[PDB]
Amino acid sequence: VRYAATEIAPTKSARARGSYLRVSFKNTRETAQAINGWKLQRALTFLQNVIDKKEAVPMRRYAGSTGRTAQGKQWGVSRARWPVKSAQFLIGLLKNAEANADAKGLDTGNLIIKHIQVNQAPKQRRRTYRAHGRINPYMSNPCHIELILTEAEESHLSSRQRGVRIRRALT
Template sequence: MGDFGYSFEGYDPTRHVRASLREKQISHKHAREISLHIRGMTVEKARDFLQAVIEKKRAVPFRRFKRQVGHRSDPGVMAGRYPEKSAAEFIKLLDNLESNAEYKGMDLDRLTIVGAVAHKGILIKRFIPRAMGRSTPKNNVLTHVELVAREA
């Protein structure tokens, strides 16, 4: 595994805490939309939101990748979906972030997410054999997610 850095600028080890998820098989589009939505929330509020997404009570608003996405009845959400697999991975990442904050001696109730970023990871190339000696590519893009929180 390579040496990874963080894209968050202005990191102060005394005020900030960070956690990352590397090379996960989740949709980078879903991860981007979740990251955009939970930025600015407290950790508890973000966890409640992600639990509601898994239970299909709240939808994640899609802002960039919204073509052919149906509208939802949530207030303030036009196009949206319920990315359960990505939401479950984000909950694990929030648990990791809280553990890191607890290790640093920070107050968990005052943590606010100030940086949430999703990047495309490596491309896993595979091929499906077809008739007449042909093959069809089946590619899988892994995803990196970074969270940075600040004690308010």
């Protein structure tokens, strides 16, 4: 398996991934972008707060005709939501990566989410019945998720130029 962030070595880092996960790709993208670059304990606490509706995920790209809330003021937005299913899946993946770091012997309390990326998985093709004997797609858009945690951490001058510099050094 090959992760997208190829510049990160595996010796002092932890990694986790999940594939074909039947959870909303757009909501998961917003949640992952919310926790991108954070410390691990802060991210876990934030995702539990998202489940408990005490902290909100700001909706930035996939936000068309959504609602507004007072909890977006922490992020400087008005559109924010509480994607519980995305938070649960990301909590599971983050806890797997924490267990991997504990197995590797890394210090858990100093870990940050260096890389986190949500990709689109192949779509689940259900169908729905419309009027006049028509059939439309009713598809699911699942996602692949990957995450990596790391530790928090005068040449070719002209002769006139040379002469000017020498004279200025002398005087």
